[model samples]
Target chain A: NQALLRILKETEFKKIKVLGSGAFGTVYKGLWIPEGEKVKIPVAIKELREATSPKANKEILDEAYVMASVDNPHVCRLLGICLTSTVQLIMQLMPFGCLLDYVREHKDNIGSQYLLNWCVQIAKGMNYLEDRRLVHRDLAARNVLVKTPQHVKITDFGLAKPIKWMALESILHRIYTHQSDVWSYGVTVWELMTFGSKPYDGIPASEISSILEKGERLPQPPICTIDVYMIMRKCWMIDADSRPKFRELIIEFSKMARDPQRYLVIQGDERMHLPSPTDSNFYRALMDEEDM
Target chain B: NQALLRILKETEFKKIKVLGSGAFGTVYKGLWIPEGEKVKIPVAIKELREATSPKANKEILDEAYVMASVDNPHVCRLLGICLTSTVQLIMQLMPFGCLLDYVREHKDNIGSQYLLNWCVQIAKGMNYLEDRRLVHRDLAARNVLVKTPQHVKITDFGLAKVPIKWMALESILHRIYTHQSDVWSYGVTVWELMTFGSKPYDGIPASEISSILEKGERLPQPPICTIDVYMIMRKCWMIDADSRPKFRELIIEFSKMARDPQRYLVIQGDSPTDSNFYRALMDEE
Candidate 1:
C-alpha cells in the first residue's frame, strides 16, 4: 500500500480530472511527469475501494490477479497498481476515448465497416482469454476504450472469472463462460451499430433479462449489413454453445474486414487475403495491446 | 577465465552442431533440450576467448553491448550470455543458412526481386545501428546470418566503433562512420547473390589484394539487375565517402528491389520517421 505513494510521487503528475464515475469507482485522466522534460505525459487511473462486504479485500485481490495476468495486444493492461487511499489501477490512457464517445460525437459519418472492426477487436480479446480458460463476465461498450482511430482495448475486467475450479455451477448469477462474454459482447456490437444506443431501448434491465431468458433479442440496426446481423444473432443464442467461438468469429469477421471490394458485396466469406477491410481488424488484434 | 565453465554448464543444450569456422571463433547451432510436449527452442552460439590485448577485450565488450541493445523482428537477438569454457554469445539462431549460401546453392531459381529483398534487410539493420550512433566497421556476408527464411541477423560487432570523438578529422579507416562498411557489404552480398556462394578471391590475402589493386580489376560476373548491382558496386569502392549511401537513400533504393509493379515501401510501424527521406521515397515510389 505504501509503495503506491512512491509511485504517485514518481509519476509526478498534476491533479487528475475525473473522466467518468461508476458504482465501484471513478475513471480519471492522469498526468505523466518526466525529469526536466516539458512534454505532456498522460495516463488513466481507476480507483476502487474495498466494498462494505467482509470479503471485499479477497474479491479485490482476485480482480488484481486477473488484471495482472492480462498482457496482450488486445486487452487493456494494468500499467501500475496503487493501494494507498484506495486500490488503484493506473493504466495507459486511451486518448481517442470510447466507441460510445465516437458514436455520440460522430454518428452521421459512421459506417457498418467501423462497427465490424470494433466487434472483431472485442472478439479477439475475449477469444484470447477464453483460450486461456478465462471469461470476461462484463463486456459492454462502456468497457471498450479506443486508443486510436483504428485500435480498441478491452478494458474493465472487474468481473472476469477463470474456468479453473470456477463456482459458476453454484453461483446465483448467470454462469460465466467465453460464451457469456460473447453474450455481453453481442450487445456491445449492437451498441456500436446503433451509435451507443441501448441494447433494447425503452426496456428496463429486468425486462431485457427476461427477453434474453426467453431467447429473444433486439433487432439489428437497419443499416447493419447481413453478415454482421447474422454474427450478432449467433452471439445472442440462448444456448451458449450455439454461439460462435472466438476463432470462428475471427475467421468470419476477418473476411468481411479485409476484402474491401467484396466487403459490401457479402458479410461472410470462407477465406480472406491481404488488401481488404479485414487487414485493419487483423492488424488491430496486434496493435490494441501495444497501444494500451 | 574460470567463470567460463560455469556459464557453459548453465547454457546446457540438447543438441549442439558446429555452424562454421572462422579465424576468430566457431559458430554453432544451439538447440534446446526438448521438454515433454514443448516446442523446440532455437539458439546460436559464438565462442569468444580471453584476448591478450585491450583492443580485443574492447571488441568483445562492444559486440556484446551492441547486440544487447538490438531487438527487432528481422534481426536475431542476443538471448543470454555464458562464460563457461570461454565467453559465449548465446543468440537467437537463424534456421535458414546465410543469404550467401542460399544465393550460391540456388542461383538458377534466385531472381533479382529475391536478392533485393535481402538488400533491403541489410539496409534496415544498418539503419538500426545508425540510429544508435554505432558504426559496424566490418559489415560482411559472413556476419549476416539467416535465423529464418528471409530473416537475417547482423552479427559479429567486433569491429563496431562508437563515433563520439571525431566526425570530420579521423578519415575513413579511423573515422568509424560505418555506413561505408555497409557499402562494402552491399557489393559482397550482391556478388555472392549472383554467384550463389562462390568464395571471394580476396580470401588469398595481400598478394591477391595488391595484384587486384595493381590491375584495377573488378568482379567477374553474371550481372545482377543493372541498377541493383551498379548501386552495390558504387557503394563497395574504396573511397570512404563515395562508398557509403546514407540510410535515407538506401531505404528508397532498397524498396525499388521489389517485383511489385510499384516499389514496396519499408514502413515499419515503430521506427522513427525521417520526413525528408520518407517524402523522397514516397515521391520516388
Candidate 2:
C-alpha cells in the first residue's frame, strides 16, 4: 500500500478549512498552490483518527493505498498525500455535499429520470471497481457525492462499514468480498429510490442480520417502479454468485433511464413494515451501533 | 421522576439551534421566552435519544430528575423540561463552555488560585450529592460547565456514560460503581485542572490503563500541581475505594488549599516555570 503512495509538500497547500467530520476523521477543504504556479483549486484533505501502534497504523495505510490507485470519472480521486504532525490525504472536492444529504433535501422537487441517470453513473463506477478486483466494503448514499443530479461520485474511503447496508455474509463472517459490495450497491439504489429514508427504517441494528438472513429484502420506495425494483432484488439474491455484476447493472439502468415514466407505477412503504408516525413505540428499542 | 417534571410547550423556544451532540442525544441552544417578559436568555435543551420503549425512556427522566433536585450554585440547574415528539430537558446556559475547553484555551491566563477554586467548588457540589446517597459515576473536566472566572458548575451526573480512562479499578473490572468510584473520577478531574486540561494517561489507550494502574502507578503530577495539591489528589486515587477520600472530606482538603492558595502552590526546587527543568522536576516520580 505504501509503495504506490507518493508524499507531497505539506506547505504546498494553503487556506485549510475543515469541510466535514466523518466517522474516521475530519476533512478539510483546502487551497492547493503548487511550486511557481498560480494554480487554483479546492482539494478535500482527510485526516484519519490517530492510531498509536505500528499494526494499527499499517491498516490505515491500506485505506490510503486503496484510494491512491483508483482512477475513474465516477470515483473520487486521491491526488496525493502530505504529512505534518500526522498523515493526511489530499482528495478531489465537490461543491455539493454527500448524496444522502442532497437527495433528501431535494426529494420533493427532483425528477425520477435524474435519479435513474445517477444510478447508471454509479453502476459504471462500480463496474470499473469490479474489474480491479476491489471491494468497496462500504457503499451507500452517505458515501456517494452529489455535484449535480447528472454527476455523482463514491467516497468514504476511510471507514463506516455500516451494518444497515451490509450483506448477510459480511455481517455474519465479516467476509466483504465483491458480492458483499453488490449487496450494498443494492441498498444505495434503495436509498436513491426512497430519497434517503434510513435503510431498514423500522429495524434496530441488532436485528438486521437476523432479518436479512431470513431472505427478507428492503421494500421498494413509492417512486421506484417494479421493473427498476427487480434490479435491486437480484442484487440482494441469497447466493452471492447469483447477484448481477456491476457491468450488467450499468447496461440495464442506462436503458431504463430512457422513458422512465413507462415503468414509473408507484408502490407503498407501508407494506415494507415501516413504523407509522402514530406508532409511539417507534424508538422503543432505541439502540444505535457504529460501523467499524 | 416524571411526576416532578413539568413539560413546557416547544413553541416558546424561537431559535432552536443545535449546540452539541452527546452519546445519548443532541443539545440545542434556544431562546426561552416566558409569558409577558421581554427578558432575553439562552437555554440548553437536551433531547434524550428516542428510545422506542417507554421503560428505556424512563432512564432519561431519571437524569432530568437528578438535575432538577440539585440547588447548589456549583451544580448546573435544570430550568425545566419541554415536549417534542422526543423529550427534551431545558438547562441554564454557560457563556464559557465546559471546564476542559476554558482551562485548555486559557492555560497561561489562569493561575493555581482559579484552578484550586474550581476543584473546591466541584468537591462541594459532589459532597452535596454524597449526602443525598447519589453517585456521579462519570466526573471529568469536559462535564463541568464554566460560567465565570470564579463560578463553575457540575453537570451530566453520569446520565450518559470516555470515562473508561477516568474509571476506578473495581468499576472498570467488575462494573462495581460505588460513590467511591466517583472519588477516583474526581481525582482525574483535578488532574485536568492541574494540567490545564491535559488528558489523564495521555496517549495511552483504555485497554492499557488497567495494567498501568494496578501496579500502584499513577499519572505523574503536572508541574503546576504543587506537592500539597498532588498529595490531595493521590488520596482520592488509592487502590482501595474505602481508602479514597470521600467528596465531603475532599471538599475540606481542597478548601484548605483554596483559602490560602499561595501556601499550597509555592514553586518547589528547580522551578520548571523558568526553563528545561521539567524532566528533572518530574524525575522523582
Candidate 3:
C-alpha cells in the first residue's frame, strides 16, 4: 500500500492533464525532472496503478523492461523508470500532444492535403520496428505519439512482440506481421484524415475482425481519395503476400508525402517526369553559361 | 621538322648490347625482326643530346613544371632540376623483362644476400618525386631499365612536371607541371627496374651536360643494396616542391631505413645492453 506512495514521493513528480484510461491504469499527463544539473528538464511520466494480480503486475513490469531496452529516435525513448508496487516509465516529454488529441480537435478539414506528411512519418516509425521483425500489435492513433511541430514518435511497445523470436501457434503473431502493422498504419492514416473517428466506430471490433477475415476493409475515407485510397486498400489485404512490405510502403509514402512535387493536395500521384542523364549534361552546360 | 620518324625504318633498329652511361634514358636490347607482325611497330629509342642553347633552356626546367607533367617507368622523371640543362635524363625502353630474371640468374648466390622477399613489389616508381620539395625532372634509368616480369609495360609520359600553371613565375613558362606527368615518370622507372641494367643508346648524340653541372653532387652509382635505396634516390633526385610534398612523411618507412651502424640490434622487450640504445631509451624514457 505504502510502496506506491513511496515510489511517487521518492522522485519529484508534477501533475499534467489526464490523457486517458485503460483497464489496468489511468493514463495521466505528468512531468518528470531528470536527475541532472540542467534547469527545465523535459520528461513525460506514464503512471501505473497497483495491479490486481501477479499476471497483471508482470505485464506492467514487462512494459517497463521492454521500453528500457529500446533507444531509437523514431520510437519512444525512456528517460527514467520508477517501480514501486506499480511501474512508471519516465519518458521524453512529447509537448505537441497525441495523434488522438490532434484528430479529435481537427476532424472537419481533413483530406489528403493535411494528413499526408504525418501519415508518412508514422509509417517510417513502423518500418523501423518492422526491420527489427517486431510488430506493434496494438498500433492505433493513441499509441502513435508525436513531438511538436514536425516529429512523430511511436510509443507503447508493451504489446509489441519480437514475432521472429517467438514460436507461437496463436493468430496474434501472424496478425502482427510487418504487413499487418501496415494494415494498422492504414487505420492510423484514417484517424489522421478523419480527425480520430472512434476506431471501428459504429462497428464493433469483432465485426471489423469478421469483415477483415472475409477480406473486407474499413470503408475508404473519401477525403483520402486519390492513390492513397489504393494504398489504404493494399495495406488491408487479407493475404499478407498481397500487401506491400513495410520497406515498400515506406518508399511509397516517402514519395507520396515526403516529395511534395509528386502529389497535389488531392492525393492523386502526378507523374514525376525527370530529365534523362543526357539532359543532365545539357542542363549543366546551360548552367555554366548562366553562372558566367 | 624531324619531330616524327618513319615507322618502318625505325622498326629496323637493332636491339643493342647492355651499356652503361649515366642513365638519362632506359636502354633495351630488342630484335627488330622487320618481317614479323611487329615489323613496322616502332621500338622505343633514347637520344642524349647537349642542350642546343643552355641559357635559353633553363638548366632544369622549373621544378613544378616537371612533376606536374611526366609519368613513365622507362623515362627518367625529373625531380628538382639544376638551373641548367647540363644534367641529363636516364631512360629504359617500354615493354621490357622483369626483376626476377636477375634473381634467377643469380639464384646460386641466394643466401649471402637476395632481393628480399619480393619486398619492393609495392615500391612504386616516381612516388619519390612527390617527396622533399622536388619532382623528378627526369626519371628513366638506362642501366636500371628492365621489363616487369609481370606484363612488362613501359608507360612514358613524354614529359613530367609539377603544374606551375597558376602560381608559377613568368620566368618558368616553358615548364611542365600536371598530375599527368608524375604518372609518366613512375611508369618509366617501373620499366627500367624490371629489366636488369639496359643501355640507353644505340646511336645518338651524347650529352655531357649532367657530367658538367653535377660534378660535386653526382648521383651515387645506382645502389644495388635494396629497393629502399630508392628513397635516397628520391631525395637526391627530387627536382621540385609539389613532386615533394612539404609534410609527406612516413615514419614507418623512415625508421626502417634510418638505422645507424653504430647501434646494436634490440628486439622488442629486450633490455638495452648497448650504451647507445640504453642512452636513447633513457632520453625517451
Candidate 4:
C-alpha cells in the first residue's frame, strides 16, 4: 500500500472538456505534461467527489496505492494524483472509449482475430490483478477500453463496485474476492462474444440473485464454440473455489486464439449478424456502473 | 542493464517526414499509439547508423537503458525502442525545436522572463543529471529543446558526442569531462540566449578559443547585455573547475532574475574595451 505516489500539481494541467460526471465524481478530457516528456499528453482527469469527510481521503488513497503498484499495458495506468482543491486521478486517456461500444458499432465487419485478441488482452489484464490479489468487483466490456484494433485495456477498478456482473457469492452474501472477480470476467467475455449484449438480457435485475442461485448460467453466445463456451462455464461455477483464475483463463483463451477460425466456423462458417444501434434499447444500452 | 525497454513495432507508426539526416543517421517526425491510449501521439524516430554490427546494437541499447531509467521533466523521454530494419529510438517529439533556433527566431521580441526561464530550466535539467551522478558530457543551447514559451527540455545527451566552442579550458587539454565542463558549456549557452543566439567569441577563430580562455580572457558582455547576468556567466567561467557554481545555484539565480528583471539590468555598467572589439564611432564621425 506504500507505493510511491506522484503528487501532481493541479495547476500544471488544463481541462479540455467534461467527459462525464457521476456519483463517483467528474471525468474530463485533459492535458498534462508527462514526467520527462516535452509534449503535453492527452489525459483523463477523474475528480473525486467533492467535500468529503476526513476518512474519504484515505479511502480513495487506498485505491491509489493499488493503481500505483499495478503496471501493465492491458490495465489503465495511473499517471499521477493531484491533491488540489479537489482530489484528482490522472489516467492515460483511452480515446477509443468502451469495448462494448466498439463491438456494437463494428460488429458486422470486425474480424474474428480482433475479438479473440480483445479477450486475450482482457484476460492478460485480469491475470495481472489476480497475481496481486486484487478483486476487480466490476469487470465487464463497459469497464474495458479498446486501445486499438488489436489491443484493449481494463479500467474503472474502483477497489470494489458493481452488481450486474456479480458472482453468486457476491450477489448472495456480499462477499468479494479474486475468485469472485473471475466470475465477472466470464460475463465480460460473454459480452464480447455476443457483440456487446448485456447478460440475462430480459431477466429482471431484482431477480438476478435468485436466478444465479438457481444454478442457471448465461446461454452460449451464438458466436461461441463449445470449447470457448466451456471456458466461460468454468468461470461461472456456482462454487467460487471451482472457478478458473485469470491466469488459467488467459491460458485457455490464448489456446483458443490460436485457431480463431475454430470459433468463427461454429454455425457453418456463416458470420453472426448484429442489429443496428437504433434497433432497440439493448443495443443502445450505454451504461455507467455508478447507478447499478 | 536490463531496463524495461518499450519495444514498439515499426508497423504501428507512420513516418510523417524525414526531419533531418547526417553521419549519425536520420530522424523522422512520426506517429505511434501510446500504450493503453487511443490516439496516435507525435513521436521523434531516431534511426541509428544503418547495418550496425552486433557491437553497435549493444552500444546504442546502452544509451536506451540510461534513457529508459531517467524520468524527469527536463530530460527527453525514451518512449520506446523499435528494433526494425534499423534500430530506432522512439522519443517524445519536442515540436518547437532547438533552443538556439527559437531564440534566433524570437530575437527581436523575446521577454526577459522567457530568456531567464529558458536558462533556469536548462540548469534545472543539468541539476537533475548532477544529482543522479550522470554528466551531460555535452550541454549547450543546441542540445536543449523549447517545449513552449515557458518550458525547456535538454536533449542530445552525447548519443553520438561537440564541440570546441563550448569546451572548458581544462577539458580542451585533458579531454576528460565532468559536471564542471558541462557548467562551462552552460555559461556559453546563457551567453547565447542573452545575445539572442549569436555565436560566442565572434570574429575569433575556433582553434584559438582554448588558449584565449586559458589566458583568462572570456567573452565580454554584449552591448545590451546586463551586468548581473554577465557576472553570473563569469562565475561559470572560473578556470578552477571546482570554483564554478552548481547548476542548482544557477537555477535559483536565473529564477530570481526572471521575477525581478529590473534587479538584473545595468544601473551602472562598463564600457566595452579593445578586446570587446568596439569600433570607434567618435573618430569616424
Candidate 5:
C-alpha cells in the first residue's frame, strides 16, 4: 500500500517557519537541500501533530497517496514525504494563499469576467479529479487556493469525510463519491459568489437534513449571474443522480468564460448587465463607497 | 551541433490559450500529451518569433542548456524544448501570474510582512544566481513571476538581457552587468513592490536619470515602506560595485525582517466594522 511513498531524513529539510497547523498536522515553510547540491528549493512540510490510532495514520497515508498519484496543473504538487518523529508530507506551497481570503479581499477589484474565469479554473481542476475517479470530498473555497490571481487550484483532501458540504447520500450512508463532490462544489460556488460569506447562514447542522428533504436550497447570492446561479441549482438537486457531473460543469464554465457579456447579465435582460466594479464605470461607484 | 538539443514535434502539444506575446517569443498555455498517455500536463510553450542569425541561435541554445542544467525553486523550471519550423521552449506555467500584476492588483490587501516575505524570496533566488556567477541582467517586477502570491520566481534569465530602465547606474553608463548590477535592480524591484508597482522614476525624465543617480540621489521611501527596507535599498545603490551588498547579505537581512511577526501590517481580522480595517480599505483605493 505504501509502495508509492518515498522516505526522507529529517536533516534533509530545514524548517523555515510554520505556515499553520490543523487537527491532523502542522504545515511549515521549508527549504529542501537536494543530495549533493548546495541550492535549496522552497517546500511546504505538513507534519502529523501527534501519535494517534492506526485509523488516523491510514487517513494521512490516503491523503498523501491521492496527492502523489496526480500531476496536474489544477492540483497541488506533492514533492515527497518524510516519516521521522511524525509523518511529514512535503508539497509545493501555493503563495497566493487560500481562495476564501482572495475573494473576500479582492471583492471590489473583481469583475464578472474575473469571477467567471475563477469558476472555470475550479471546474477544470474538478474535471481532472472526475477523470481520475477521485472524490475531493472537502471541496470548498477554503480548500481551493489561488496559485496566482488568475490561477486557482484545489487542495486539502484531509477532511474527505461527510460534513457540511457533503451530499445528502454521503451524510446518511457514509459514502464518499464523485457525486458528493459535485454537491460540495456547488456550495463552493456560493462561497465565491458571496465573497466567502457563510454557507446556509443561520441554518444549524441538525436542521440541514430536514431542510434538504423539503427541496430547499440557498438563495441566489446578490452578485451572482443568472447563468452561475443556474449551475449551482443543478449541483444541489436532492437526488444524487440528478446532479451535473464535473465534465458538464467544466463545459458550462467554459461557455461562460468564452462569452462573459451574454451570460453575466440577468436572463433575457440586456439592460441589466452587471457592471464590473473594477471597470471605469465602477470608478464612480468606488468613489461613492469612498465618500461613505 | 543539433545533438546537444532535444527535438520535439509540434503535434505533441495542444495549445490551450495564448498567454501573451513579446519581442522574443509568443508564450502559449499548452497541454503536453506524452507519447502514449491520455493525460496531459499543462505547460507554457515559448515559441521564438524569428529565424535568427547563427550567433542568436547559439545564444538561445546556450540559455536553454544552462536553464536545463539548473534546478531551483526560485528559478523558473524549464521542462524541455521543441524544434520544428521555430524554436519552442516548454516551461512550467507560473499560474499565479506575474509579480507586477499581483502587486498592483492586491496592493491594498497585502500587508508589509507579506511584501517583505516576497523580497526574501527574490533575494534567495538572486543568491542562487550569485552562487552560479549568473547575472540576471533583467531583474524587475515584470521579470519576477508568482507561483503563488507569496511564492515568487525569477524568469527569462538569459533571454531577457535585452535592456530596461531598471539597469543600474554603472551598468547604464558602462554597459556592464554583473551580480552587483542585479543587486541594484533588486533594490528597484523592492521599491516597486513597496509602492504597489509604481514606476521607479515616476515623473523624472530618463535622460536625467543618469545624472540624477550620479549625484547620489535615490528614490524616496514609499509611504508604506519601512526604514529597514529603505536602508537595504540605499546600500544596493552604492556607486562602487564592491560596496553593494551581495544577494546573500540581502537575503539574510530580509529574512530577519520576515521572521519578526510585528514587522508586518495585518490585512484582515474578525471585525469587518473595525475603523482600522476601513482605513486600510480606503487607503488602498
Candidate 6:
C-alpha cells in the first residue's frame, strides 16, 4: 500500500531531453547522475508548470506523494522529488511507451496470449491500489504505460478529477470510489480489445450518463469474445456492489491468462441490430433524446 | 484575404458544447438549427480565447479568410462565422476525429489499402490547397481530420506555422513558406501515417533540425512503407524546393498506388523505435 519516499538533491539528475509538455508541466527524460554511482539510470521528471499558488503547489506535490507510496511492480515508481525554486516529480522511465500506443501499433499482429497478459497485469496493479483503499479515478488505456514488452505499469495522477474515464457515480454525484475504478477498468478492457478506440467513439458526453442510467452499455468490439465481454458487462453493472472487486478481477484475469486458448474466437450472436462499421448508429441512438 | 465570410446569428445554433481546447481557443460542437431547415447540421466551431487585441483578431481571421476562399471535397468546409464577444468559425463536424487519433486507433487493424487511401486523400487535399496558391505551413497528420472510414479532410488553418521538426530547410533558414515547403511537410505527414503517427524526428531536439538537414540527413523510412512510397517521400524532401514534386503530381502517384494496394502491402515486423509523442499531446488536451 505504501513505500519509502524521499526528497532528493537537485544535483543528482541532469535533463537529457524533453519527453513531453502540458499545462501542468513538461516531462523530461533525465539521466540520474548520482554521486558514487558510475551507472546512470534513465528517469522521467515532471517539472510542474510554475505553481503560482501555494494551494496548487501542495496539490501537485500531493499527487507525487501518493504516487511515491505505490511500490507495486505494475505501478510506475516515483523515485523522488526536487523542491528548490520549482516542484518536480522523478518517476521510472517506461521505455516501451504507453499501453494505448503499443496496443494501437500491434493491434492485429499481437496474439491473444499477449493481450490477456496485459489485461492480467493491469488487473494485478489495480488490485494492489485497491488494497491501499485508493481508487484510480482514471484507468483508461492512455493512463497505463508499458515498461517492457511483457510489463504494464499504470501512471498519471496529477489531475484525476476531470478525466474522460470517470464512472457514472463519479459523474453524477462527484463520488470517486474503488467501484468507479471498476467501471473505468471495464472501459480499459474495451480499449484493449478495440485497439485504442475512443470510449463512446463519437457519442457526446452530455448523453452518456442518461444512457448509462438506462443500463445501456457500449457495444462489444468485433474482436471481443463472449466470455471477456461478459466480464466487462459485469463491471458496468448499474449497482456498484454487483461489479467484481479488484481482487476478484485479478483472479479472473489470471485464470483467463492461464487458459488463453479458450477465448480466441470472436463472439457472433447479436450484431444485426448493432451500429455500422463506424458505429454511427450508437451516436444516432444517443441523439434520440426523446426516447430517454 | 479581404473576403467577408458568411455570418450566422448566434440564436440559430443550439446545444453549444466544447469539444476540445488549446492555448488559442476552444473548439465547440454545435447543433446548427437554421430557419426553414428540417434537419439540423452538426458543426465544429472554433472560438478564440481572447479577441481584445485588434491586431491579433485580424491575424486570426486572416487565416479564416484564406480557408473560406477554397471549397474542395478533401478540405474541411467552412460553413459560416458567429461574431459575438468572441469570434467563432463554424465548420463541418468530422465524426472520426483527427488523422493522428484515427491512425492510432486503427493501426493494428489497418493494412496498406487503408493506409494508402489516407495518403492519397491527404495528397489530393494538398493539391487543392496548392491549386488555390495557399500554403499549409503547419501540414501534418494532426492537422488532417478523418470524416469516415473512406474519407479524410485537411483543416486547422489558423495560426498554422512550421512545426520545427517538420519544417523545410529553406523555411527554417529564410522564414519562407510556399507550396514546396508544404511538399516537404507532406513528405513528413506521409511518414507519420506510415508509422501510425510516430514523431517526425523521434525525440531529436528542435535545435538539431538545422544541422541534421544541413548534413543532408532525412528521416529513415518506416519498415512498413514500401520502397516506392519511400521514394515519393524522398522526392518531396529534395533540398531544392524546385526539384520537389508538386501536390498534383504526388496525388496522382498516391492514387495509383492506392488503386493497387496489394502491391504496396506493409509486412509486419517489430517497430524499430517507440516514443511518447502522441501520449504527451493527448495529456495537454
Top model number, DockQ: 4
Poorly placed runs, candidate 2 (over 4 Å): A1-292, B1-4, B35-40, B158-161, B266-285
lDDT of 6 by residue, B221-253 (tens): 887877999989999898999999988888788
Model 5 lDDT tens row, A143-165: 78764555677886644432567
Q: Which digits, one per residue and each the tens of the lDDT, describe model 2 over residues A1-292?
A: 4444555686677646877787777888786664443334456778766634556547656666776666576776565666555567776666567888887886655565667878888887777778877777888898898643346878865353289988888888988877888889999999988888898887889899888878788997787778888989999987899999898888888888777666554343222222232111111111100010
lDDT of 4 by residue, A1-292 (tens): 3534455776667789997774568889898763433446567888877655547777767777677666576887565677765788877666677888888876766656677778888888888888877777888888898654455788888555256688888877889888888888889988988988878878887798887777789998887778888888889888888989788877777877787778754333335332222211111111110110
Better of 1 and 6 by lDDT: 6
Could you report the DockQ of all the candidates, in the order they appear? 0.02, 0.01, 0.01, 0.06, 0.02, 0.01
Instruction: Tell me the spans in candidate 6 whose CA falls farther than 4 Å from its real position.
Output: A1-292, B1-4, B14-16, B21-24, B35-40, B52-66, B158-162, B268-285
Candidate 2 chain A, poorest ten consecutive residues by summed lDDT: A283-292
lDDT of each: 0.56, 0.71, 0.43, 0.72, 0.71, 0.72
- The fnat score for candidate 3 comes to 0.00
Location of the lowest summed lDDT over 10 successive residues in candidate 4 chain A: A283-292
On TM-score, the stronger of 2 and 4 is: 4
Writing each residue's lDDT as its tens digit, candidate 1 over A1-292 gives 2221223343555437988875568889877553333334457877774433436645655556556566466787554555555656666777667778777675655444565677778888888888767776667777788765566778877553222111222123647777777767777777777777765556654445555556667686765666777887887776678888888887787777775334333233223322243323222322221432
Error of 2 at A152 (Å): 60
- Give per-residue CA lDDT, model 3, range A41-122, as digits (tens): 3346666665345676566555554544543445764444455456665665555567787667644433342466676667
Real A-B contacts recovered, model 4 = 0.07
Interface C-alpha root-mean-square deviation, candidates in order: 21.1, 23.1, 32.5, 26.7, 22.7, 19.0
- Across all candidates, what is each one's fraction of true contacts kept? 0.00, 0.00, 0.00, 0.07, 0.00, 0.00
Best by TM-score: 4
lDDT of 2 at B16: 61
Q: lDDT for model 5, on a 0 to 1 scale?
A: 0.71
Q: Which segments of candidate 3 are over 4 A away from where they belong?
A: A1-9, A33-42, A52-65, A107-114, A160-175, A258-292, B1-285
lDDT-superior candidate, 2 or 4? 4
